[PDB]
Amino acid sequence: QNNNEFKIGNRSVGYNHEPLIICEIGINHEGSLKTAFEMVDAAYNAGAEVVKHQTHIVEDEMSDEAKQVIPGNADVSIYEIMERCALNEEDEIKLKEYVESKGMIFISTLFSRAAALRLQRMDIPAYKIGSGECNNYPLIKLVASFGKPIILSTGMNSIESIKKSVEIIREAGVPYALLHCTNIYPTPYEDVRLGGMNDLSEAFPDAIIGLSDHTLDNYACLGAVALGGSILERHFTDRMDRPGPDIVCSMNPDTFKELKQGAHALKLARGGKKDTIIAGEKPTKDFAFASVVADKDIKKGELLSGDNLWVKRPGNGDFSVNEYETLFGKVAACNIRKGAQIKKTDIE
Amino acid sequence: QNNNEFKIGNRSVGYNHEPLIICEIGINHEGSLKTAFEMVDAAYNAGAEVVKHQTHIVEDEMSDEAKQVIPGNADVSIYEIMERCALNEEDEIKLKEYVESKGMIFISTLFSRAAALRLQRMDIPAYKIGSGECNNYPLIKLVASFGKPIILSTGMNSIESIKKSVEIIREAGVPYALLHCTNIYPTPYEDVRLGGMNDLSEAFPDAIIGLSDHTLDNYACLGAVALGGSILERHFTDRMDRPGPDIVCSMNPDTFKELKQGAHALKLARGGKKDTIIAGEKPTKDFAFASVVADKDIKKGELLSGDNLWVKRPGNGDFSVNEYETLFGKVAACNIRKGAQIKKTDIE
Numbered sequence: 016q017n018n019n020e021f022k023i024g025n026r027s028v029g030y031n032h033e034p035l036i037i038c039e040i041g042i043n044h045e046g047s048l049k050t051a052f053e054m055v056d057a058a059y060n061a062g063a064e065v066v067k068h069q070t071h072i073v074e075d076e077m078s079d080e081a082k083q084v085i086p087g088n089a090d091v092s093i094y095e096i097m098e099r100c101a102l103n104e105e106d107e108i109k110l111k112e113y114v115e116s117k118g119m120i121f122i123s124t125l126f127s128r129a130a131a132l133r134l135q136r137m138d139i140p141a142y143k144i145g146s147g148e149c150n151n152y153p154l155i156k157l158v159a160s161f162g163k164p165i166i167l168s169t170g171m172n173s174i175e176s177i178k179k180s181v182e183i184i185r186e187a188g189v190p191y192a193l194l195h196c197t198n199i200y201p202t203p204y205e206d207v208r209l210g211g212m213n214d215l216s217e218a219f220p221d222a223i224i225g226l227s228d229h230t231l232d233n234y235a236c237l238g239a240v241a242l243g244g245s246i247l248e249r250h251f252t253d254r255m256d257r258p259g260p261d262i263v264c265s266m267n268p269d270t271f272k273e274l275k276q277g278a279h280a281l282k283l284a285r286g287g288k289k290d291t292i293i294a295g296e297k298p299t300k301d302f303a304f305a306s307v308v309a310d311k312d313i314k315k316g317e318l319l320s321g322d323n324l325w326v327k328r329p330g331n332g333d334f335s336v337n338e339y340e341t342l343f344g345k346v347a348a349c350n351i352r353k354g355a356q357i358k359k360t361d362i363e
Numbered sequence: 364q365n366n367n368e369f370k371i372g373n374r375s376v377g378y379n380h381e382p383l384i385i386c387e388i389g390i391n392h393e394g395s396l397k398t399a400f401e402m403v404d405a406a407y408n409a410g411a412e413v414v415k416h417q418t419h420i421v422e423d424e425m426s427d428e429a430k431q432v433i434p435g436n437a438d439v440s441i442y443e444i445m446e447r448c449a450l451n452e453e454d455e456i457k458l459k460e461y462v463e464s465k466g467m468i469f470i471s472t473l474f475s476r477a478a479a480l481r482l483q484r485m486d487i488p489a490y491k492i493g494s495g496e497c498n499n500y501p502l503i504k505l506v507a508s509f510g511k512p513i514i515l516s517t518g519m520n521s522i523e524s525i526k527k528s529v530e531i532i533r534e535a536g537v538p539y540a541l542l543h544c545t546n547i548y549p550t551p552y553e554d555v556r557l558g559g560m561n562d563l564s565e566a567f568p569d570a571i572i573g574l575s576d577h578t579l580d581n582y583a584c585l586g587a588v589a590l591g592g593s594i595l596e597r598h599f600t601d602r603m604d605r606p607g608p609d610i611v612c613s614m615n616p617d618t619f620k621e622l623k624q625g626a627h628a629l630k631l632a633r634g635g636k637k638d639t640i641i642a643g644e645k646p647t648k649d650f651a652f653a654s655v656v657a658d659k660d661i662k663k664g665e666l667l668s669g670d671n672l673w674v675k676r677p678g679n680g681d682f683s684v685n686e687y688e689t690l691f692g693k694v695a696a697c698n699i700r701k702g703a704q705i706k707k708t709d710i711e
């Protein structure tokens with residue numbers, strides 16, 4: 016597909032690299048460090064490489080209008096949800112340290128200037144911009160100025176809209192990924208449109224391409240790997256019985272382990288070319304391909320024809336089935352036995 | 364992707380149709396009808412739509428040379444394997460009837476003229492040509508003359524080689540599918556090259572495209588569905604403890620059920636376009652997108668600027684973040700409160 020790559024800390028991402036699964040803890044901790052650490056533990060023990068947070072600072076990310084508006088996956092205002100779930104700066108610094116103490120990478124999504132600046136003080140190795148902020152060009156400008164790679168989700172946005180964000184990122188000269196995404200919690204399979212990933216790669220040839228997903232299972236992400244995706248994001252929980260608006264579409268340790276295994280298999284299986292010769296098929300080719308044989312007894316001097324020739328396994332005859340018609344009209348140099356392979360010496 | 368379709372009996376296959384899984388019993392019955400019927404039962408109970416056989420007639424498909432040649436997945440000659448596993452005509456007619464008695468479709472692969480003619484007497488609704496016969500042009504001509512759709516596997520063959528077979532099929536005027544395939548039993552993930560499917564569709568725009576697979580699990584076939592595959596073939600057994608050269612790469616009832624579920628999900632998720640507007644995202648767009656707000660108290664008569672304006676959720680403000688820069692240089696028509704959304708009435 017392509018050779019685009021960049022590093023998130025010491026981890027290379029790109030088509031020629033192992034896909035990267037981002038375990039999005041997000042707001043799943045419901046504002047509790049005990050719960051957050053239990054989820055980091057679970058991620059670690061499952062084999063995760065990256066844990067992503069959401070950095071919410073209620074007053075800088077929302078005006079008072081947000082106290083009147085309810086998201087699709089809750090029955091209270093988005094302001095109330097964020098007031099309940101948001102970690103303060105001190106606590107989020109502890110979370111980052113904890114994630115790093117487990118040898119994993121910590122990144123986060125910012126939803127405001129104040130959050131961008133907080134994350135820069137913490138010096139995270141890459142910045143996630145959520146689909147809601149994909150068209151937030153002032154915020155994109157700010158984050159791109161930080162000098163680190165950007166992972167940009169592109170739900171709810173057209174190629175045209177995304178173009179302006181990519182323009183800002185390139186000007187700042189940082190590498191970037193684009194994740195195709197659909198922001199319904201949860202998302203039905205029919206709304207995923209994996210082909211959206213192809214649209215993105217075509218429009219933005221220098222982007223690393225992946226999928227951020229909110230379906231109920233791993234199928235969409237697995238398809239994404241097959242199509243060439245390099246980054247996969249699902250929300251993550253230690254257990255599915257947890258409360259919270261995003262828990263329903265979250266993976267857990269077991270399903271994370273499944274995705275990691277599948278992603279590895281599909282990283283190996285994907286791409287390549289039809290005409291590539293595969294050495295291990297040789298024993299099959301040698302028995303399975305056909306050679307030209309006599310379909311009847313043929314007397315010396317008689318002409319070979321489609322009437323007295325046919326083809327049979329295996330492939331070690333002097334004449335391959337590919338050469339069948341070329342023997343038509345040749346002259347038997349000797350008597351030929353029905354069922355025998357036609358030999359070079361059997362023809363004049 | 365495309366709108367190519369044809370029917371196998373009453374079952375439509377093509378990109379706009381549910382993918383079709385072919386349960387390849389092949390030689391797995393080791394020549395026993397009891398075992399074959401146990402495998403048909405298992406297929407039926409698992410939810411299979413199609414059971415495929417292999418029609419082996421040892422004397423017409425192989426010359427005596429085959430008694431000296433061993434396949435990659437056995438330690439005895441291919442002749443001995445086929446003598447052991449081949450069902451005679453009477454028995455194969457019983458198998459077909461049994462499959463049809465369970466409401467499933469019966470098809471088979473021929474490896475010889477005699478087998479083609481046997482299958483035509485049985486009037487099967489579509490003919491499978493295995494990868495070994497993909498370059499067997501005389502046999503392809505014969506089968507195409509029968510007037511039924513052809514499913515052609517293309518392992519071990521280049522686009523160039525396949526072209527000659529497609530030419531023969533088109534001349535006969537029957538619809539056809541091409542299955543990408545790698546013929547190692549089993550096949551490592553790295554040798555699958557799913558991109559081979561794209562190569563085929565590009566080269567042969569009128570073909571229905573699928574995958575015939577010999578890996579140890581469902582990952583390759585799932586990837587194939589994501590890429591647009593319409594037909595999936597794996598060998599099938601009622602249980603994995605059975606003896607035989609192809610058992611190791613076979614699916615069983617449980618894994619068939621998994622593939623069917625995955626294929627359905629990925630049929631729904633695949634393709635589509637990035638720019639398609641998804642109604643269910645609307646509640647997310649309404650809270651997540653930003654509007655322009657005052658970043659400081661602005662006195663009446665003062666000029667709006669990037670210094671006193673910023674952006675915040677939610678998206679119901681008079682000015683979207685998209686319009687942010689257009690307010691620069693406008694004149695406050697009244698005092699504006701820090702944190703308030705900029706209203707149309709706030710500017711001259």
Ligand SMILES: CC(=O)N[C@@H]([C@@H](O)[C@H](O)[C@H](O)CO)[C@@H](O)C[C@@H](OP(=O)(O)O)C(=O)O
Nearest residue numbers: 041069086124143145146147168227260651
């Ligand atoms: C529109 C939005 O901000 N959605 C939140 C989501 O977790 C909400 O905070 C939650 O569902 C509110 O109920 C995340 O899905 C956003 C997420 O990015 P993506 O899902 O757009 O890839 C991120 O990087 O934080």
Ligand SMILES: CC(=O)N[C@@H]([C@@H](O)[C@H](O)[C@H](O)CO)[C@@H](O)C[C@@H](OP(=O)(O)O)C(=O)O
Nearest residue numbers: 303389417434472491493494495516575608
């Ligand atoms: C080269 C060949 O004929 N391989 C056999 C296979 O089952 C052998 O009979 C078996 O492995 C011999 O040990 C099948 O895989 C062929 C199979 O087609 P495909 O695997 O090329 O799609 C078919 O349609 O019958």
Ligand SMILES: [Mn+2]
Nearest residue numbers: 039227228250
């Ligand atoms: Mn998300």
Ligand SMILES: [Mn+2]
Nearest residue numbers: 387575576598
């Ligand atoms: Mn096969």
